[PDB]
């Protein structure tokens, strides 16, 4: 076929019930994730091709960057609760990987303050049980697919994007193939 299991995607032999329709995993420590966000705008281009009525979910993971990696998953939970994903994503990536000015929870917090979230609001969200369960969700979703690598996308709890089997000569052509593959899997 044009789209084949093991080529543009793999199938989970252990499918995950009740999973979000389009589920994406990343880490601010993850170099390809930086590319996916900054250079390729994958999430965005997938959205532009998804049928509407489809919701898009993105979660952070713990298994990179030890202690700070976990701080980052809590901070992303804060970003999700406050609805400010789009204001912190870029400065978090660049603070971790480009300028390397993020070294502690306090530096993560500085990024949010600078992005305009109030101190009081950030620390209250940081310490809230709504953020604790949001952290719990992120971990559970990753756990459910025995996730050992990022970036990673799952569709309908049963297909996993396989970007290694797509062309990388052309950045734009890669993205479209990637997004079309999500759409195909979506309609499957």
Alpha helices in 83-118 (DSSP H): 85-93, 105-114
Indicate the resolution in Å.
2.1
What ranges do the domains of the chain cover?
1-188
Q: For residue 16, with 0-12 CB atoms within 10 Å meaning exposed, 13-18 middle and 19 or more buried, which class applies?
A: middle
Are the C-beta atoms of 107 and 113 separated by less than 8 Å?
no
Query: Of 122, 188, 166, which is closest to residue 32 (Cα–Cα)?
Result: 166
- Within 8 A by CB and 6+ apart from 168, the residues are 174
Q: Which CATH class is domain 1-188?
A: alpha beta
Distance CA 151, CA 32 (A): 7
Would you say 41 and 178 are in contact if contact means Cβ atoms under 8 Å apart?
no
């Amino acid at each position: 076929a044009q789209y084949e299991d093991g080529k543009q995607y793999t199938t989970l032999e252990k499918p995950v019930a009740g999973a979000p329709q389009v589920l994406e995993f990343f880490s601010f420590f993850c170099p390809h994730c930086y590319q996916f966000e900054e250079v390729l705008h994958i999430s965005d281009n997938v959205k532009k091709k998804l049928p509407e009525g489809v919701k898009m979910t993105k979660y952070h993971v713990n298994f990179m960057g030890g202690d700070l990696g976990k701080d980052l998953t809590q901070a992303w939970a804060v970003a999700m609760a406050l609805g400010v994903e789009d204001k912190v994503t870029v400065p978090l990536f660049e603070g971790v990987q480009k300028t390397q000015t993020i070294r502690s929870a306090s530096d993560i917090r500085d990024v949010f303050i600078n992005a305009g979230i109030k101190g009081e609001e950030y620390d209250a969200a940081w310490n809230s049980f709504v953020v604790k369960s949001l952290v719990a969700q992120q971990e559970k979703a990753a756990a459910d697919v025995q996730l050992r690598g990022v970036p990673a996308m799952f569709v309908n709890g049963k297909y996993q994007l396989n970007p290694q089997g797509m062309d990388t000569s052309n950045m734009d052509v890669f993205v479209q193939q990637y997004a079309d593959t999500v759409k195909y899997l979506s309609e499957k």
